[PDB]
Amino acid sequence: INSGTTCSNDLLYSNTEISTGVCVNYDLYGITGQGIFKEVSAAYYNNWQ
Amino acid sequence: HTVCKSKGSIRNESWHIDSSEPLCLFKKNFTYNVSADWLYFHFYQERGV
Ligand SMILES: *[C@@H]1O[C@H](CO)[C@@H](O[C@@H]2O[C@H](CO)[C@@H](O)[C@H](O)[C@H]2NC(C)=O)[C@H](O)[C@H]1NC(C)=O
């Protein structure tokens, strides 16, 4: 209990829904900040990127 | 020592003895092209990461 490597994702981080229009807090892959989101069609990404 | 299943000759694959799976932090598999010339790898550490 309260140890080991077997945990669960039942915390507040439960795959929340994205939103556009208002700047919110950022926790995207160990990065913080704020900013308005805007949907844009981009195709310069890769699998590891 | 470690052998490969591709036409084994004498020895067998045996490098550790563990009757139970210990606490593991990372374990995964990746794929690559089986028909290539050479494979490059790069390892390092910084600030404990
Ligand atoms: C794995 O590597 C081989 C050789 O490097 C790739 O075969 C080449 O594929 C290209 C794309 O059609 C051809 O133009 C070359 O003539 C092929 N070379 C040979 C020697 O066959 C193969 O496509 C690679 N596979 C993957 C999944 O990356």
UniProtKB/Swiss-Prot annotation, chain A:
Q: Which domain of life is it from?
A: Viruses
> Its biological function?
Attaches the virion to the cell membrane by interacting with host receptor, initiating the infection.
Q: What is this protein called?
A: Spike protein S1
